[PDB]
Every structure is written in C-alpha cells, then in structure tokens.
Amino acid sequence: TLKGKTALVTGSTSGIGLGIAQVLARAGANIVLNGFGDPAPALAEIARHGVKAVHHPADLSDVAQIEALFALAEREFGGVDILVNNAGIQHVAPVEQFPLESWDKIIALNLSAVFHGTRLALPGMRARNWGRIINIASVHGLVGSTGKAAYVAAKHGVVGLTKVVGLETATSNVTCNAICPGWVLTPLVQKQIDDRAANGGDPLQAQHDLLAEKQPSLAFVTPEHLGELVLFLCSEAGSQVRGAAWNVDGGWLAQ
Amino acid sequence: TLKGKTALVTGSTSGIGLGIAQVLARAGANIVLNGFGDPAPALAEIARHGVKAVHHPADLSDVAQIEALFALAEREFGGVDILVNNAGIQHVAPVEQFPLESWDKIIALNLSAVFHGTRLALPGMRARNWGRIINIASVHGLVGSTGKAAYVAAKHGVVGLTKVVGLETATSNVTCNAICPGWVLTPLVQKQIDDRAAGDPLQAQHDLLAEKQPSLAFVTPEHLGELVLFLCSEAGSQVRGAAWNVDGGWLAQ
Amino acid sequence: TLKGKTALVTGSTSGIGLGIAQVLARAGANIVLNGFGDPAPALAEIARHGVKAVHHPADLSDVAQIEALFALAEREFGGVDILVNNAGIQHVAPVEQFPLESWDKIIALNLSAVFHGTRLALPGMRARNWGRIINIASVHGLVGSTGKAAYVAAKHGVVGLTKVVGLETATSNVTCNAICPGWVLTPLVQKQIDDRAANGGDPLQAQHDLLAEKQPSLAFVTPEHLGELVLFLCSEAGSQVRGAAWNVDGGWLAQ
Amino acid sequence: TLKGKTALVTGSTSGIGLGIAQVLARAGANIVLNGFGDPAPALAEIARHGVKAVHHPADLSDVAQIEALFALAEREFGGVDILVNNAGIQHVAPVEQFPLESWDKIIALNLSAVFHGTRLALPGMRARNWGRIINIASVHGLVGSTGKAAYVAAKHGVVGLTKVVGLETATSNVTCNAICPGWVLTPLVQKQIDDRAAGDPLQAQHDLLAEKQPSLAFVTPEHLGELVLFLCSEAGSQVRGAAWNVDGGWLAQ
Ligand SMILES: NC(=O)c1ccc[n+]([C@@H]2O[C@H](COP(=O)([O-])OP(=O)(O)OC[C@H]3O[C@@H](n4cnc5c(N)ncnc54)[C@H](O)[C@@H]3O)[C@@H](O)[C@H]2O)c1
Ligand SMILES: NC(=O)c1ccc[n+]([C@@H]2O[C@H](COP(=O)([O-])OP(=O)(O)OC[C@H]3O[C@@H](n4cnc5c(N)ncnc54)[C@H](O)[C@@H]3O)[C@@H](O)[C@H]2O)c1
C-alpha cells in the first residue's frame, strides 16, 4: 500500500499517534516517531512490522526542537512523504480563570506546531510531487464545550489552517486534510476507566458515563480506526480530498 | 471483504452509482442495480467481479415502485446490508423561472426517495445487527450555486436527514452517512458543459471546473466507491451522521 | 422605519408569525396576514398599530392557495416588499416508522411553500429594486435531533434554498436570508407549560425541563426577539447580508 | 439607548473599529478607544455624539498592556459593559514562505488578544449582571483563502473561542458572539488591492471583490456597527456563541 513511503507522526510514542503509526507501518511505510519516554519499545512495536523507524524526542512547543525533528527525518529518510500532525494537550477551566501559561501551551502544541510541521514538510512534498498532510484535530475544531477555551480555539485554528493548505496545494498532488475525532480510547481515558474498576466499578459503565453527554453511540473511536482513515487519505482515492475536516465522532456533531 | 453482504445502489446504470457498484462488487458484495437504460452493460460490469447482480427498474419517483425494489432485494438476496442512495437529477434555472414540475421531481427523487429507501432498509439492518446507509449528497448539500434552487434544497435535506438517521442508529451497528462530491465527469455534468459551450467544449469543461473546484481536476466514480468501501469497514463503525466532502477544495474556500 | 413598505408573513394569525407581524407593523409596514382562525382579532392586533392589514386563509401545502394568497397581496397592496416565510408543522417518530403523509406534509409546508412564496414575490422585488425575503428556518436547518427526520430535512432544505436565492439576488438590492431559532415560546409550548401548571407543577420548572437537553441558556427565544431581527434584516444595515442563516438559539449550535 | 453603558472597542482608531465605535457612541455609550496613530481624530469623531471618550494606546501584543487598558476602563468609567474585540492585522504569503514572526504576531493579536480581552472583561460583566462580548472575526473564521495561513487560523480560533464563551455565559445576562464580515474597504484591504495593482487600481479593487463577494459591493463599517448595536439589544439576549456573517454572499457559495 505505502511501500516506499515515509510517514512522520507527532506524539506517536503512545495512544492515537502510535495507533496511526502502527497502521501505516503495516501498510509498508517507514516511520519517524516522536514523543516522550524510552522510545525502544515504540520503535520495536514499529520495526516488528518489517519497516524502518527512527525517533526524535522533540517538544513541539519549542520551534528549534521541531526543526531538529524534521532535520532528523531529512537525514535518515530523505524527507517525509506523509505528515501526521497529532497533538499534545488539554486543560479545563472557565475562560476568565483560564491560566495564561496553559492558553499559550495549548496554542503552541495544538495549533502552531501544525504550522511548523507543515512549513517544514511541504517543500519536499512539492518537489517530489506527492504528499499527504493529515492534521488530527477534534470535534472541538467544529464546536465548543464549556471549560475548553484554548483547546477549542487551537483545534478550530487547525481546521482553518487545513483549509488554507488544502487550497494552496490544490493544483498539485499534495493534499492536506483534518480528521476530527470525538472521544477516543487513549491511555489517559483508559486510565480513568481502570481507576474506576480498581475502586470496584464496572469498566463499561464508566465508559457509558464518560460518553453519555456528548457521544450518542456510547462507543469509543479507536486509534486503529483513525489509522485506517489516515491510510485511506493516503490512497489514490484520497487524491481529490483537499482541505476537508472529516469527523469520526459517534454522532457528536450530528446533533 | 464485502463477501456475504448485499449492496443496493440506486441509479447505478451509469455515472457515480455504476462506479460505486463496481467497487463494491470488486470487494465481493452481491449487487442490486437500479436505474434507466439497458441494464445488460451494468450487469456485465458488476458480474465480471465474480459476484451475482440483478437489476430492478424501479422509478424512484414512485413510492410503490421503491417498495417493490426492496421486496425483490429481500426475495433475491435476503435483504439489503449496504444501501447507497445515489439516483439523482439536475435542472438549472433561476428560482423565479424554475419549472414547478422540476421542483417537485427533484425534491421527490433527490430527497424523498432517500427517505423512502432508508425507511425500507433500516428495519432489516437493525434486525440483522449490521448495516450501512450511504447517501450521495453533494457539495450542494453544504453550499449553494445560482440556478440550482431545487437541487441545493434537496441535497441540504439529504445532509440533514443523514444526521437524524445517524443519531437514531447510534446505539446500533448500523451507520448512516453522506458523501459530498464536487464535480465528477458524468452525463449530468456533461449537459452543463454543453449548455455552457452553446465555443470550445473543452474550454467550457475547464471553465466549469475552475469556477468551483480549485484542484482543476474532476473527482472519479471509482474514488467515491473506494470511500463507500471505507465507510463499510470496521473503521467506519463510529462515523455516524457525517457529511464527508470529496471535492478538490470546493468547500475549503 | 418601514413606513411605505408591505410585509407578507405566513402563519401569522398566532405565535411566531404574529409576533413578527406586530414588530413590522409598529415599524410602519402594512401587513398581509395568513393563517387559520377568525382573523378579526389578528387584523385588529395589527390595525391598532396605525397600519393597514388584510388576511388570507391559504393552506400553504396547496399551491393554488398560495397563489391566491399572493394574488390578494398584489390586489390590495401592489405586491410584497418584505416576505417572511414562516411555517407549519412538526411530527416526531423514528425514521423507519415516520408516516408517509406526515413526511409529505412537513416537506410541503416547511420547504416547498418557501420556494412558492419566493418565486411569487421575487419578480416584483426585482422590478422595484428593493426587497427582503426572510425564511424562518430552525436550529434543525443546521443540525439533527432524533425523531425529526422530515422537519430536519425540510429545514436544512430551506437553509440551502436561502443560499441559492441569496446568490441569485446578490447583484441586486434584494436579499434573502434565514433565521434559525432554537426553542421559542409559542402558544403550543406555552400550552405544554400551562398544562403542567394546571396539574400543579411550577411553570419555570416545566420550562427548564423542556429546554435542558438542547438549549444551554434555559431561556426562550421570543416572537418579539425574532421580529426585531427581521426588522434589522430589513434595515439598510442588512443590505449586504445575503444567503445567511443566522441562529438565535440560547447556545444550541455552539455545542 | 446605550445610555449608561461603557463600550471598549479595540483597534478603533481606524476602519471597522472606528465605524463600530461611532455607532455605539451615537447610541449613547461612553467609549474607550484603542489603537495606533493620532487618537485626536477618533476622539473627535466619538465625542461629536455628545458622549465621553478616552483613548488608551495599549499594544494588544502585550498582555501587560491589555491589563493596563482594562484597569483604565475601570478607573475612568467603572468597567466595560460592551467589549468589541476588533484589532487585527493581515499578512499574505504561501504557508511555506510565511514569516515566522508574522505567524506569531497574527496569532497573538488576532486570536490571543481576543482571549485576553474576554478574560479581563467577563468578571465585571458577570458581577454587574449584564454584558456583551462581540468578536470581529471574518468570513475567514469559516472558510480559507490562499496565502492567509495565520489569519485564517486565528479567525477560526476566534469563532471557536466565541462558542466556548457563549456556552459558559449561557445562564447569565452576558452574551458572546462573533460577526464575520466579508470585504470592507479599509487600509487592510487597500494594501491587498495595491499589491494586486502593482495596472488600474480600480480594476484591482473590483477584481478583488468579485473573486469572493457575489454582491460586487463592499460591506461598510457603519453596517457592522448597526449589527453590534442589535446584538447589544434585548433581542440579542439569546443570541449566544454565534458567528453571524455579513458578507455579500461570500459564504453562501
Ligand atoms: N456528477 C457530479 O458532478 C455530481 C456531484 C455531486 C453529487 N452528484 C450526485 O451523484 C448522483 C449520481 O449522479 P451522476 O452524476 O452519476 O448522474 P447520472 O445522470 O450519470 O446518473 C444518474 C443515475 O440515476 C438514474 N435515475 C435517474 N432518475 C431516476 C429515477 N427516477 N429512478 C431510478 N433511477 C433514476 C439514471 O438512470 C442513472 O443511473 C446524483 O444524486 C447527483 O446529484 C453528482
Ligand atoms: N477590512 C476587511 O475586509 C475585513 C473583513 C473581515 C474582518 N476584518 C477584521 O476587522 C478588524 C479590523 O480590521 P480593519 O479592516 O478595520 O483594519 P485597519 O487596519 O483599518 O484597522 C486596524 C485597527 O487595529 C489597530 N491595531 C493594529 N495592531 C494593533 C495592536 N497590536 N494593538 C492595538 N491596536 C492595533 C490599528 O491601529 C487600527 O486601529 C480586524 O480584526 C480584521 O481582521 C476585516
């Protein structure tokens, strides 16, 4: 499928990023992983698919470090064919009490990192006349929730940026799109559930409690589901999908 | 991959519906075809994929014929697992000059027939614990164009219907979603190209595309069938009530 | 404000239509009322504002009757300067059990009547090079709810039709826009509340119960609020508002 | 009508912000002006309406200066009842050539300063049981254009922020909404017209409008001030978290 391609997935040492990375690896792509932690387990999870991988620990709020991450991709793989901008971080507080440092960090990681990844990957994509930029946004790139000022702003910004990049690259074989997930089973969400079960509560009940307000299906989107969508967007059938923001959300945005 | 599944694609005797049907057959689904013209060519295109196909000639203007369509699917194949509501027509005129019969016919086929297909297919999908309803809407379900009063109304209606059905089925293994294409080179678009050329036909074709579709490239029926196939996969399981555009950048600006 | 103008408001013998009619009358517009009932009270409610009014009982699911309604407006007032398409009707059922006659009626009144009103009013608006068409749609022209297949389809159709008409009239002084209300205090909603109070329950509690699911403000939009918005759209400041769908919804669509 | 109310309009020394400030003053609000250039002309435009005005020169890039802006409003007038987050800048370049300092400056002013204004104004609005926060976003908060990476991102951010704040304040008499203009003839747009003309300047002006805005007519600052005035009325009381476009048809297609 993607034999001969290289994908860079940000925040891919765990959760959504890792799930997407795994699907792409199985499809035959070499992977540039990024994220916190010993990367030996993550690299091994990719390499066991019979593909090459490297990792860079870049903190994507630091532009110098994002530059280092792309310089590594250029050195080891000759540049990125497929960039997955996957991100960071959340903080909940009413707008008037929303911490200034948390606003700045959420903007830096969830929004500005996407611009920097994009400006760094796009020249090589154009030069090779083939490329895919996939921005993992959120239902919160299309609607708001209480307590999430910075995250909703940042994710809406990503949806907007995606449109501009989709338009700028429209006459080329490079596309840029966004996927907007609802509730996803991440290690953090799984921890919330496990913490309920450790107290003695029922894990499925904990899930239904978490999802009831916003997600009609009461069922999680999985990293595997998102990886499969990324894989679709990288296919020939994705060639005229441009500047789109496709929601995978168990009905969140339908109401 | 769709082996063991039955797909019904309305208006599959040409253009997009035929493209979608081909991809689903290639995936292993048995197919119920529908639409006007000689069905033999469409039947041969599907069955080359080593799958069974039948054509039913229902005029989807007529609710009784839609019912006969679904009853045949039930007797032939034991019911519809994947329903693609594709059949559609176009008429271009300013709203105050828009023929009343065209408004009624476009609403009846491009909107009401989607509701009729959906209502007929959903009970068996529920009862068998799995289903996919995919509505072929348009960029015109999300935005307007001049001269397209009935079509844009109907297509917006389809996008709204899709949300209701997606919500209603959210606690089941049935999903309902819309695909919103930009320009695809079919007889429907050719007529618009010709009416513009009435003049170099290829210049008319380019101008028609360039006005709306930044990629300056048409979407293909095969691309759209591959998306239907994706929405039929397990990865589509929590895509519900969505309207996903494949449009060369039409809606991004 | 609108001295010298004529407004036709469909479904204006009560509720939202009447509220809009009243605001326009106070602004100085003559009114063409339409709807069920003895119209003497409704006409008198308009005429006491020092404006002229007429009424036609047209059932807007019957195209011949819609024609009669506009023929009356042409005869008595020389045509409509301001058309408010305000509508009909609701029915709740799962899609697979949604009655065929109810689908057809809801489409006819909530959607097709808008096309017919529009085709009948627009020639005279262009001829006079001034006009306003305002379609009272719904939050359900932008999102779905369970049990409302026909109404959501019809209201989405109205939002689409509004865009086409806004574009077709863009180079002229005629505009066409939609207002998309959330929960509105109508006589029917007031009846639901009164029925609760007659049993002994608290009226404000009944309101909070009705609104809690969908409308964060827990407060109604009123016909007066909607009339004031119509009035704004008819002002010079509305001259470049074209094909818009403006929501007044206590936060419904923000989430 | 706004008699007894205090409005703060960021970036009100020219263009849209000055237009909005004028209409609010005419309505009877006392005004806190802000923005670069000689403030005397703007002060004279507002005070001709028989209202008090002060100008504070805060560079909204700088959060400490935003705080001093709001503290002055508090000492001068007892706080801000109507906040219009208007100040904004533009820079056009392809994304991969987009200056890093321009990305940061556009995000800081066109998005983060809206959050800072909002956070500073909301407590007093809540405490006094009434308020209006109106964000001047753009059609570019809803769609993209080529070369406008930072601006479109920021404006989409503003439209999202607006929804959160509208929800959060929904059980109060404070509303927060966005107005999304299409093209308005200001210095910001003039620069784009000039860069296109670099060539008849009036042809450049028309072409710039016609590409995006079907009405072939600019929106005026006065029109936008009249909308702010409407959103400040009782009829605006349940308009919450909305993004209302005034755009000559830009978003309808
Ligand atoms: N072609 C495009 O650019 C484009 C873009 C977006 C959406 N669409 C939509 O795609 C769908 C298919 O359109 P297309 O371009 O392939 O057009 P097409 O004319 O090539 O095919 C239409 C099909 O529908 C059938 N049909 C027409 N009326 C019917 C009726 N009453 N009952 C049963 N079948 C009927 C025709 O026989 C044919 O099989 C339509 O819903 C159209 O609105 C088309
Ligand atoms: N003009 C348009 O077509 C258009 C369309 C949609 C939205 N907008 C938005 O309208 C708003 C006003 O733009 P405009 O067209 O009137 O532009 P303008 O350049 O004429 O006015 C901008 C104002 O903001 C001020 N300003 C700039 N930087 C500032 C800073 N750091 N701190 C404080 N004030 C600052 C300027 O001094 C001026 O008062 C912007 O947010 C813009 O994005 C403009």
**d(Cα B32, Cα B15) in Å, to the nearest integer?**
16
Touching C (3+ Cβ pairs <8 A), the chains are: A, B, D
CATH architecture of A1-255: 3-Layer(aba) Sandwich (3.40)
**d(Cα A93, Cα D159) in Å, to the nearest integer?**
19
Binding residues of C for NAD(+), as ranges, are: 13-14, 16, 36, 59-60, 86, 151, 155, 184, 186
Strand partners, D136: D179
- Owner of token pair 């747009």: D189
Q: Which two tokens stand for residue A181?
A: 């997930």
Contact B175, B131 (CB under 8 A): yes
Look at D215 and C254 and tell me if their CB atoms are within 8 Å.
Answer: no
Would you put residue D248 in left (φ > 0), alpha (ψ -120 to 50) or beta?
Answer: left
Q: How far apart are the CA of B222 and the nearest CA of chain C, in angstroms?
A: 28
Give the type of residue at A198: A
Closest C-alpha to A223, from A187, A185, A183: A185
Resolution (Å) of this entry: 1.9
How many residues are given for chain D? 253
Closest C-alpha to C170, from C227, C102, C101, C240: C240
Check if C19 is active-site.
Answer: no
**d(Cα A60, Cα A42) in Å, to the nearest integer?**
19
Q: Which residue of D has its CA nearest to C215?
A: D170
Contact D135, D112 (CB under 8 A): no
User: Which of B214, B215, B223 faces A237 most closely, judged by CB atoms?
Assistant: B223
**d(Cα A46, Cα C224) in Å, to the nearest integer?**
63
Q: Which residues of B are catalytic?
A: 151
Domain at D1-253: CATH code = 3.40.50.720
**d(Cα A124, Cα A13) in Å, to the nearest integer?**
25
By three-state DSSP, how is residue B13 classified? Answer: coil
Q: Which two tokens stand for residue B193?
A: 């190209």
Q: Which residues of D touch A107 (CB under 8 A)?
A: 107, 111-112
- Owner of token pair 């379609």: C135
User: Which of C144, C254, C255 faces A254 most closely, judged by CB atoms?
Assistant: C144
Q: Which of A70, A77, A151, A183 is catalytic?
A: A151
Interface test with D, best of B155, B247, B253 (most D CBs within 10 A): B253
D194 is in an annotated binding site: no
- Number of Cβ within a 10 Å radius of residue B86: 27
Contact A234, A2 (CB under 8 A): yes
Would you put residue D194 in left (φ > 0), alpha (ψ -120 to 50) or beta?
Answer: alpha
How many residues are given for chain B? 253
**d(Cα B94, Cα B134) in Å, to the nearest integer?**
30
Q: How far apart are the CA of B220 and the nearest CA of chain A, in angstroms?
A: 9
Closest C-alpha to A31, from A13, A55, A5, A53: A53
Contact C126, C174 (CB under 8 A): yes
Q: How far apart are the CA of B88 and the nearest CA of chain D, in angstroms?
A: 21
**d(Cα D68, Cα D57) in Å, to the nearest integer?**
10
> Cα-Cα-Cα-Cα dihedral of B123, B129, B135, B136, to 10°?
-140
Judged by its nearest atom, the ligand closest to the C-alpha of residue B89 is 1
B90: phi then psi, degrees, rounded to nearest 5: -135, 150
Q: How far is the CA of B19 from the centre of ligand 1 (A)?
A: 11
- Number of Cβ within a 10 Å radius of residue D97: 11
C133: phi then psi, degrees, rounded to nearest 5: -115, 120
Q: Which of D103, D151, D183, D250 is catalytic?
A: D151
Give the type of residue at D24: L
The radius of gyration computed from the CA coordinates of chain B, to the nearest angstrom, equals 17
**d(Cα D144, Cα B130) in Å, to the nearest integer?**
38
Give the 3-state secondary structure percentages of chain C, helix then strand then coil, rounded to 5.
50, 15, 35
- Number of Cβ within a 10 Å radius of residue B101: 9
Q: Which two tokens stand for residue A81?
A: 């064919």
B92 is in an annotated binding site: no
Contact D243, D141 (CB under 8 A): yes
Strand partners, D118: none
Contacts of D6 (CB under 8 A, 6+ apart): D29, D30, D31, D32, D73, D77, D78, D79, D80, D81, D82
Q: Which residues of B touch D143 (CB under 8 A)?
A: 251-253
Q: Which residue's CA lies nearest to atom 41 of ligand 1?
A: B88
Sign of CA dihedral C186, C189, C194, C200: negative
Judged by its nearest atom, the ligand closest to the C-alpha of residue B85 is 1
E strands in chain C: 6-9, 30-34, 53-56, 82-85, 131-136, 174-181, 245-248
**d(Cα B90, Cα B139) in Å, to the nearest integer?**
14
**d(Cα C253, Cα C250) in Å, to the nearest integer?**
9
Q: How far is the CA of B85 from the centre of ligand 1 (A)?
A: 10
Look at A251 and B215 and tell me if their CB atoms are within 8 Å.
Answer: no
Q: Does B156 touch chain C (CB under 8 A)?
A: yes
Residue D36: C-alpha distances to residues D32, D40, D107, D155 (Å):
14, 11, 19, 21
